[PDB]
Design an enzyme around this catalytic site. Structure first.
Site, PDB file in Angstrom:
ATOM      1  N   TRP A  53      -7.485  -6.239  16.190  1.00  0.00           N
ATOM      2  CA  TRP A  53      -8.937  -6.041  16.218  1.00  0.00           C
ATOM      3  C   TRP A  53      -9.537  -6.253  17.584  1.00  0.00           C
ATOM      4  O   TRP A  53      -9.266  -7.276  18.224  1.00  0.00           O
ATOM      5  CB  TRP A  53      -9.586  -7.039  15.257  1.00  0.00           C
ATOM      6  N   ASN A 172     -11.314   1.163  12.025  1.00  0.00           N
ATOM      7  CA  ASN A 172     -10.342   0.851  10.995  1.00  0.00           C
ATOM      8  C   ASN A 172     -10.727   1.475   9.655  1.00  0.00           C
ATOM      9  O   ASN A 172     -11.817   1.232   9.132  1.00  0.00           O
ATOM     10  CB  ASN A 172     -10.177  -0.658  10.857  1.00  0.00           C
ATOM     11  N   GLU A 173      -9.826   2.312   9.143  1.00  0.00           N
ATOM     12  CA  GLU A 173      -9.909   2.924   7.810  1.00  0.00           C
ATOM     13  C   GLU A 173     -11.245   3.571   7.420  1.00  0.00           C
ATOM     14  O   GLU A 173     -11.745   3.308   6.329  1.00  0.00           O
ATOM     15  CB  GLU A 173      -9.484   1.904   6.738  1.00  0.00           C
ATOM     16  N   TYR A 256      -0.601   1.425   1.084  1.00  0.00           N
ATOM     17  CA  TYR A 256      -0.920   0.338   0.156  1.00  0.00           C
ATOM     18  C   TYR A 256      -0.907   0.834  -1.294  1.00  0.00           C
ATOM     19  O   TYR A 256      -1.970   1.150  -1.859  1.00  0.00           O
ATOM     20  CB  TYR A 256      -2.276  -0.296   0.507  1.00  0.00           C
ATOM     21  N   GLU A 291      -0.142   0.761   9.260  1.00  0.00           N
ATOM     22  CA  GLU A 291      -0.270  -0.316   8.285  1.00  0.00           C
ATOM     23  C   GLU A 291       0.574   0.009   7.070  1.00  0.00           C
ATOM     24  O   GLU A 291       0.494   1.112   6.525  1.00  0.00           O
ATOM     25  CB  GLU A 291      -1.716  -0.508   7.830  1.00  0.00           C
ATOM     26  N   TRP A 322       2.066  -4.723   7.949  1.00  0.00           N
ATOM     27  CA  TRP A 322       1.001  -5.681   7.807  1.00  0.00           C
ATOM     28  C   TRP A 322       1.525  -6.788   6.932  1.00  0.00           C
ATOM     29  O   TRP A 322       1.862  -6.543   5.776  1.00  0.00           O
ATOM     30  CB  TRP A 322      -0.224  -5.004   7.196  1.00  0.00           C
TER      31      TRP A 322
END
Length: 357
Positions: A53, A172-173, A256, A291, A322
Protein backbone atom coordinates in the site's frame (compact mmCIF):
# COMPACT_ATOMS: atom_id res chain seq x y z
CA UNK A 1 17.91 -1.60 -13.95
CA UNK A 2 14.21 -0.67 -14.29
CA UNK A 3 11.73 -3.55 -14.67
CA UNK A 4 10.51 -3.70 -18.26
CA UNK A 5 8.24 -5.73 -20.54
CA UNK A 6 9.09 -7.70 -23.66
CA UNK A 7 5.89 -9.19 -25.05
CA UNK A 8 4.36 -11.66 -22.54
CA UNK A 9 7.36 -11.50 -20.15
CA UNK A 10 8.68 -9.11 -17.55
CA UNK A 11 12.32 -8.28 -18.16
CA UNK A 12 15.13 -7.17 -15.86
CA UNK A 13 18.31 -6.15 -17.69
CA UNK A 14 18.65 -8.49 -20.68
CA UNK A 15 16.83 -11.45 -19.20
CA UNK A 16 13.17 -12.52 -18.78
CA UNK A 17 11.90 -12.18 -15.21
CA UNK A 18 9.55 -14.83 -13.77
CA UNK A 19 8.87 -14.56 -10.04
CA UNK A 20 6.72 -15.45 -7.10
CA UNK A 21 6.20 -12.26 -5.10
CA UNK A 22 4.19 -11.49 -1.97
CA UNK A 23 1.89 -8.92 -0.34
CA UNK A 24 2.47 -6.84 2.79
CA UNK A 25 0.00 -3.95 2.63
CA UNK A 26 0.91 -3.20 6.26
CA UNK A 27 4.49 -2.05 5.56
CA UNK A 28 3.34 1.58 5.84
CA UNK A 29 2.41 1.06 9.53
CA UNK A 30 5.16 -1.31 10.61
CA UNK A 31 8.00 -0.37 12.95
CA UNK A 32 11.47 -0.36 11.42
CA UNK A 33 12.60 -3.71 12.86
CA UNK A 34 9.55 -5.31 11.20
CA UNK A 35 10.04 -3.53 7.86
CA UNK A 36 13.55 -5.02 7.85
CA UNK A 37 12.16 -8.41 8.90
CA UNK A 38 9.76 -8.55 5.93
CA UNK A 39 12.65 -8.09 3.49
CA UNK A 40 15.04 -10.62 5.06
CA UNK A 41 12.26 -13.24 5.31
CA UNK A 42 11.39 -12.55 1.66
CA UNK A 43 15.05 -12.87 0.68
CA UNK A 44 15.64 -16.29 2.29
CA UNK A 45 12.27 -17.48 0.94
CA UNK A 46 13.45 -16.52 -2.57
CA UNK A 47 10.92 -13.75 -3.20
CA UNK A 48 12.30 -10.81 -5.22
CA UNK A 49 9.16 -8.61 -5.33
CA UNK A 50 6.60 -7.31 -2.83
CA UNK A 51 3.27 -5.56 -3.47
CA UNK A 52 2.15 -3.06 -0.83
CA UNK A 53 0.00 0.00 0.00
CA UNK A 54 1.09 3.55 -0.88
CA UNK A 55 -2.17 5.21 0.15
CA UNK A 56 -3.46 6.01 3.65
CA UNK A 57 -6.28 8.51 4.03
CA UNK A 58 -7.44 9.47 7.55
CA UNK A 59 -6.22 10.72 10.93
CA UNK A 60 -4.63 7.71 12.66
CA UNK A 61 -0.99 7.54 13.84
CA UNK A 62 0.14 7.08 10.21
CA UNK A 63 -1.55 9.04 7.43
CA UNK A 64 -0.55 10.09 3.93
CA UNK A 65 -3.69 12.07 3.00
CA UNK A 66 -6.39 13.79 5.03
CA UNK A 67 -9.15 16.36 4.63
CA UNK A 68 -8.63 19.78 6.13
CA UNK A 69 -12.02 21.13 7.25
CA UNK A 70 -10.46 24.55 7.96
CA UNK A 71 -8.61 24.85 4.62
CA UNK A 72 -11.15 23.03 2.35
CA UNK A 73 -8.19 21.08 0.95
CA UNK A 74 -6.89 17.54 0.64
CA UNK A 75 -3.54 17.85 2.41
CA UNK A 76 -0.52 15.51 2.12
CA UNK A 77 1.78 14.32 4.93
CA UNK A 78 5.52 14.57 4.29
CA UNK A 79 6.40 13.83 7.94
CA UNK A 80 9.35 11.51 8.61
CA UNK A 81 7.55 9.41 11.25
CA UNK A 82 3.83 9.78 10.57
CA UNK A 83 3.91 10.13 6.78
CA UNK A 84 5.71 9.47 3.49
CA UNK A 85 9.11 9.27 5.19
CA UNK A 86 7.89 5.82 6.22
CA UNK A 87 7.75 5.00 2.49
CA UNK A 88 11.28 6.40 2.04
CA UNK A 89 12.48 3.91 4.65
CA UNK A 90 10.61 1.04 2.99
CA UNK A 91 12.19 1.78 -0.41
CA UNK A 92 15.60 1.96 1.28
CA UNK A 93 15.40 -1.44 2.98
CA UNK A 94 13.91 -2.91 -0.20
CA UNK A 95 16.88 -1.63 -2.27
CA UNK A 96 19.28 -2.87 0.41
CA UNK A 97 17.90 -6.41 -0.15
CA UNK A 98 17.67 -6.21 -3.95
CA UNK A 99 13.91 -6.44 -3.53
CA UNK A 100 11.46 -4.60 -5.78
CA UNK A 101 8.20 -2.82 -4.88
CA UNK A 102 4.74 -2.65 -6.45
CA UNK A 103 3.08 0.44 -4.97
CA UNK A 104 -0.71 0.65 -5.04
CA UNK A 105 -1.85 4.28 -5.01
CA UNK A 106 -5.48 4.00 -3.86
CA UNK A 107 -8.06 1.44 -2.70
CA UNK A 108 -11.62 0.52 -3.77
CA UNK A 109 -12.58 -0.53 -0.20
CA UNK A 110 -12.68 1.45 3.05
CA UNK A 111 -9.42 -0.02 4.43
CA UNK A 112 -7.18 3.00 5.08
CA UNK A 113 -9.75 5.35 3.55
CA UNK A 114 -9.40 4.49 -0.15
CA UNK A 115 -11.70 6.10 -2.73
CA UNK A 116 -14.63 6.62 -0.35
CA UNK A 117 -12.58 9.15 1.68
CA UNK A 118 -12.32 11.34 -1.43
CA UNK A 119 -16.05 10.97 -2.15
CA UNK A 120 -17.21 11.80 1.40
CA UNK A 121 -15.02 14.88 1.84
CA UNK A 122 -15.59 16.35 -1.65
CA UNK A 123 -19.39 16.11 -1.31
CA UNK A 124 -20.07 13.09 -3.54
CA UNK A 125 -22.73 10.50 -2.70
CA UNK A 126 -21.85 7.67 -5.09
CA UNK A 127 -18.72 5.48 -5.01
CA UNK A 128 -18.22 5.79 -8.73
CA UNK A 129 -18.25 9.61 -8.39
CA UNK A 130 -14.49 9.05 -8.06
CA UNK A 131 -14.45 7.78 -11.67
CA UNK A 132 -16.11 10.87 -13.21
CA UNK A 133 -15.90 13.89 -10.86
CA UNK A 134 -13.27 16.34 -12.20
CA UNK A 135 -12.63 17.85 -8.74
CA UNK A 136 -12.08 14.37 -7.17
CA UNK A 137 -9.85 13.23 -10.10
CA UNK A 138 -7.69 16.38 -9.72
CA UNK A 139 -7.07 15.51 -6.06
CA UNK A 140 -6.02 11.98 -7.04
CA UNK A 141 -3.78 13.50 -9.72
CA UNK A 142 -2.07 16.01 -7.42
CA UNK A 143 -1.42 13.11 -5.00
CA UNK A 144 0.05 10.97 -7.79
CA UNK A 145 2.26 13.89 -8.87
CA UNK A 146 3.44 14.38 -5.29
CA UNK A 147 4.27 10.73 -4.76
CA UNK A 148 6.09 10.25 -8.09
CA UNK A 149 8.01 13.54 -7.66
CA UNK A 150 8.98 13.02 -4.01
CA UNK A 151 12.70 12.90 -3.30
CA UNK A 152 13.67 10.02 -1.02
CA UNK A 153 14.76 11.81 2.16
CA UNK A 154 17.12 8.93 3.01
CA UNK A 155 18.68 8.27 -0.45
CA UNK A 156 18.10 11.42 -2.53
CA UNK A 157 16.44 9.50 -5.38
CA UNK A 158 13.08 10.73 -6.72
CA UNK A 159 10.40 7.99 -6.68
CA UNK A 160 9.87 8.24 -10.43
CA UNK A 161 13.62 7.71 -10.95
CA UNK A 162 13.94 4.85 -8.44
CA UNK A 163 14.85 1.40 -9.97
CA UNK A 164 13.82 -0.18 -6.65
CA UNK A 165 10.18 0.47 -7.55
CA UNK A 166 8.74 -2.24 -9.83
CA UNK A 167 5.80 -0.16 -10.99
CA UNK A 168 2.69 1.83 -10.06
CA UNK A 169 -0.82 0.54 -9.57
CA UNK A 170 -3.73 2.97 -9.92
CA UNK A 171 -6.05 1.46 -7.29
CA UNK A 172 -6.68 -1.75 -5.39
CA UNK A 173 -9.53 -3.89 -6.79
CA UNK A 174 -11.68 -1.18 -8.45
CA UNK A 175 -15.37 -2.09 -8.89
CA UNK A 176 -18.42 0.09 -9.49
CA UNK A 177 -19.50 -0.82 -5.92
CA UNK A 178 -17.38 -0.17 -2.79
CA UNK A 179 -17.49 -1.27 0.85
CA UNK A 180 -21.03 -0.04 1.53
CA UNK A 181 -20.76 3.50 2.95
CA UNK A 182 -21.30 4.85 -0.59
CA UNK A 183 -23.46 3.17 -3.29
CA UNK A 184 -23.02 2.89 -7.08
CA UNK A 185 -24.80 5.00 -9.73
CA UNK A 186 -26.74 3.69 -12.68
CA UNK A 187 -24.15 5.83 -14.53
CA UNK A 188 -21.26 3.43 -13.76
CA UNK A 189 -20.29 0.90 -16.44
CA UNK A 190 -17.33 -0.80 -18.10
CA UNK A 191 -16.99 2.24 -20.42
CA UNK A 192 -16.71 4.59 -17.41
CA UNK A 193 -14.37 2.36 -15.40
CA UNK A 194 -12.04 1.84 -18.39
CA UNK A 195 -11.95 5.54 -19.36
CA UNK A 196 -11.03 6.52 -15.79
CA UNK A 197 -8.30 3.89 -15.90
CA UNK A 198 -7.12 5.29 -19.24
CA UNK A 199 -6.51 8.92 -18.19
CA UNK A 200 -5.08 8.13 -14.74
CA UNK A 201 -2.57 5.69 -16.25
CA UNK A 202 -1.80 8.27 -18.95
CA UNK A 203 -1.36 10.90 -16.23
CA UNK A 204 1.14 8.59 -14.49
CA UNK A 205 2.92 8.03 -17.83
CA UNK A 206 3.30 11.79 -18.49
CA UNK A 207 5.24 12.30 -15.23
CA UNK A 208 7.00 8.92 -15.01
CA UNK A 209 8.54 7.45 -18.16
CA UNK A 210 10.72 4.91 -16.31
CA UNK A 211 8.18 2.75 -14.53
CA UNK A 212 5.55 0.23 -15.48
CA UNK A 213 1.90 0.93 -14.78
CA UNK A 214 -0.95 -1.48 -14.03
CA UNK A 215 -4.41 -1.19 -12.46
CA UNK A 216 -4.21 -3.63 -9.54
CA UNK A 217 -7.70 -5.05 -10.20
CA UNK A 218 -9.05 -8.52 -9.45
CA UNK A 219 -9.00 -9.29 -13.19
CA UNK A 220 -12.74 -9.36 -13.82
CA UNK A 221 -13.70 -9.82 -17.49
CA UNK A 222 -16.49 -8.25 -19.51
CA UNK A 223 -17.28 -11.16 -21.82
CA UNK A 224 -20.91 -11.04 -23.02
CA UNK A 225 -23.17 -13.83 -21.80
CA UNK A 226 -20.75 -15.76 -19.65
CA UNK A 227 -22.01 -17.33 -16.42
CA UNK A 228 -20.24 -15.81 -13.42
CA UNK A 229 -19.84 -12.29 -12.01
CA UNK A 230 -16.07 -12.51 -12.57
CA UNK A 231 -16.46 -13.14 -16.35
CA UNK A 232 -19.55 -11.22 -17.50
CA UNK A 233 -18.71 -7.61 -16.63
CA UNK A 234 -21.17 -7.46 -13.73
CA UNK A 235 -18.54 -5.74 -11.56
CA UNK A 236 -18.25 -2.88 -14.07
CA UNK A 237 -14.68 -3.93 -14.98
CA UNK A 238 -13.26 -5.08 -18.29
CA UNK A 239 -9.90 -6.84 -18.06
CA UNK A 240 -9.75 -7.05 -21.87
CA UNK A 241 -10.30 -3.31 -22.38
CA UNK A 242 -7.74 -2.52 -19.65
CA UNK A 243 -4.96 -4.73 -21.04
CA UNK A 244 -5.66 -3.20 -24.49
CA UNK A 245 -4.67 0.29 -23.28
CA UNK A 246 -1.17 1.30 -24.41
CA UNK A 247 -0.88 3.16 -21.09
CA UNK A 248 -1.04 -0.15 -19.13
CA UNK A 249 2.17 -2.22 -19.22
CA UNK A 250 0.97 -5.37 -17.44
CA UNK A 251 -2.35 -6.88 -16.34
CA UNK A 252 -3.30 -7.89 -12.83
CA UNK A 253 -5.71 -10.42 -11.42
CA UNK A 254 -6.56 -11.80 -7.98
CA UNK A 255 -7.77 -15.19 -6.81
CA UNK A 256 -10.21 -15.60 -3.90
CA UNK A 257 -12.52 -18.62 -4.47
CA UNK A 258 -14.01 -18.54 -0.93
CA UNK A 259 -14.95 -14.84 -1.11
CA UNK A 260 -16.45 -15.41 -4.55
CA UNK A 261 -17.96 -18.74 -3.53
CA UNK A 262 -16.34 -20.83 -6.27
CA UNK A 263 -15.50 -23.83 -4.09
CA UNK A 264 -12.02 -24.44 -2.70
CA UNK A 265 -11.58 -27.87 -4.38
CA UNK A 266 -13.25 -27.60 -7.83
CA UNK A 267 -11.82 -26.62 -11.25
CA UNK A 268 -12.93 -22.94 -11.34
CA UNK A 269 -9.72 -21.59 -9.86
CA UNK A 270 -7.36 -23.47 -12.16
CA UNK A 271 -9.58 -22.43 -15.08
CA UNK A 272 -9.35 -18.83 -13.77
CA UNK A 273 -5.55 -18.79 -13.94
CA UNK A 274 -5.42 -20.50 -17.36
CA UNK A 275 -7.94 -17.88 -18.62
CA UNK A 276 -5.64 -15.03 -17.55
CA UNK A 277 -2.52 -16.80 -18.83
CA UNK A 278 -4.35 -17.01 -22.16
CA UNK A 279 -5.11 -13.27 -22.09
CA UNK A 280 -1.36 -12.76 -21.54
CA UNK A 281 -0.66 -14.91 -24.59
CA UNK A 282 -3.43 -13.46 -26.79
CA UNK A 283 -2.50 -9.88 -26.07
CA UNK A 284 1.25 -9.49 -25.87
CA UNK A 285 1.53 -8.19 -22.28
CA UNK A 286 2.60 -9.84 -19.02
CA UNK A 287 -0.12 -10.69 -16.54
CA UNK A 288 0.40 -11.23 -12.81
CA UNK A 289 -1.79 -13.07 -10.32
CA UNK A 290 -0.78 -10.48 -7.80
CA UNK A 291 -3.15 -11.63 -5.06
CA UNK A 292 -4.17 -15.14 -4.17
CA UNK A 293 -5.20 -16.73 -0.91
CA UNK A 294 -6.96 -19.48 0.98
CA UNK A 295 -8.29 -19.13 4.55
CA UNK A 296 -6.61 -22.18 6.07
CA UNK A 297 -3.22 -23.83 6.17
CA UNK A 298 -4.85 -27.09 5.06
CA UNK A 299 -6.59 -25.41 2.07
CA UNK A 300 -3.30 -23.81 1.09
CA UNK A 301 -1.24 -27.06 1.27
CA UNK A 302 -4.01 -28.59 -0.89
CA UNK A 303 -4.46 -25.99 -3.64
CA UNK A 304 -1.38 -23.73 -3.77
CA UNK A 305 0.78 -26.47 -5.40
CA UNK A 306 -2.02 -26.99 -7.92
CA UNK A 307 -2.40 -23.26 -8.67
CA UNK A 308 1.33 -22.70 -8.77
CA UNK A 309 1.87 -25.66 -11.13
CA UNK A 310 -0.78 -24.07 -13.38
CA UNK A 311 1.13 -20.74 -13.35
CA UNK A 312 4.31 -22.63 -14.33
CA UNK A 313 2.76 -24.62 -17.21
CA UNK A 314 0.65 -21.74 -18.54
CA UNK A 315 3.84 -19.60 -18.54
CA UNK A 316 2.18 -16.82 -16.54
CA UNK A 317 4.65 -13.97 -15.99
CA UNK A 318 4.40 -13.93 -12.20
CA UNK A 319 2.24 -14.37 -9.11
CA UNK A 320 2.14 -12.91 -5.60
CA UNK A 321 0.45 -14.60 -2.66
CA UNK A 322 -1.52 -12.94 0.06
CA UNK A 323 0.12 -12.58 2.42
CA UNK A 324 3.42 -12.71 4.28
CA UNK A 325 3.16 -12.32 8.06
CA UNK A 326 5.62 -10.32 10.15
CA UNK A 327 5.36 -10.61 13.10
CA UNK A 328 4.38 -14.26 12.61
CA UNK A 329 0.60 -14.47 12.90
CA UNK A 330 -2.44 -16.00 11.18
CA UNK A 331 -3.46 -12.31 10.79
CA UNK A 332 -6.61 -12.20 8.65
CA UNK A 333 -6.54 -15.96 7.97
CA UNK A 334 -4.28 -15.67 4.93
CA UNK A 335 -1.09 -14.78 6.85
CA UNK A 336 1.89 -17.05 6.10
CA UNK A 337 5.07 -16.86 8.20
CA UNK A 338 8.57 -17.71 6.97
CA UNK A 339 8.89 -19.72 10.19
CA UNK A 340 6.07 -21.99 8.94
CA UNK A 341 7.17 -25.63 8.69
CA UNK A 342 5.34 -26.28 5.40
CA UNK A 343 6.77 -23.11 3.80
CA UNK A 344 8.47 -25.12 1.03
CA UNK A 345 5.21 -26.44 -0.39
CA UNK A 346 3.14 -23.27 0.16
CA UNK A 347 5.74 -20.74 -1.02
CA UNK A 348 9.32 -21.97 -1.44
CA UNK A 349 9.16 -24.71 -4.10
CA UNK A 350 7.40 -22.30 -6.45
CA UNK A 351 9.60 -19.29 -5.75
CA UNK A 352 12.70 -21.26 -6.85
CA UNK A 353 10.91 -22.61 -9.95
CA UNK A 354 10.00 -19.09 -11.12
CA UNK A 355 13.53 -17.89 -10.24
CA UNK A 356 14.96 -20.70 -12.37
CA UNK A 357 12.74 -20.07 -15.47
Amino acid sequence: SFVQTSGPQFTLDGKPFYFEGTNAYYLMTSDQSNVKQVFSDMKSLGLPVVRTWLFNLGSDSVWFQQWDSSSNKMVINDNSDTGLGRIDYIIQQAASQDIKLIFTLNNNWEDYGGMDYYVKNFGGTYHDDFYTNTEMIDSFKEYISHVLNRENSLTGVKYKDDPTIFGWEIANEPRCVGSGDFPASSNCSTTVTTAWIKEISEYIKSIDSNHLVAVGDEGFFNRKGESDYEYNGGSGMDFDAILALSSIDFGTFHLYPEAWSKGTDSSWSVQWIKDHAAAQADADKPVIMEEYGLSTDALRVAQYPVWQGTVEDEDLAADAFWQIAVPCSTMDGFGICASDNDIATTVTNHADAMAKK
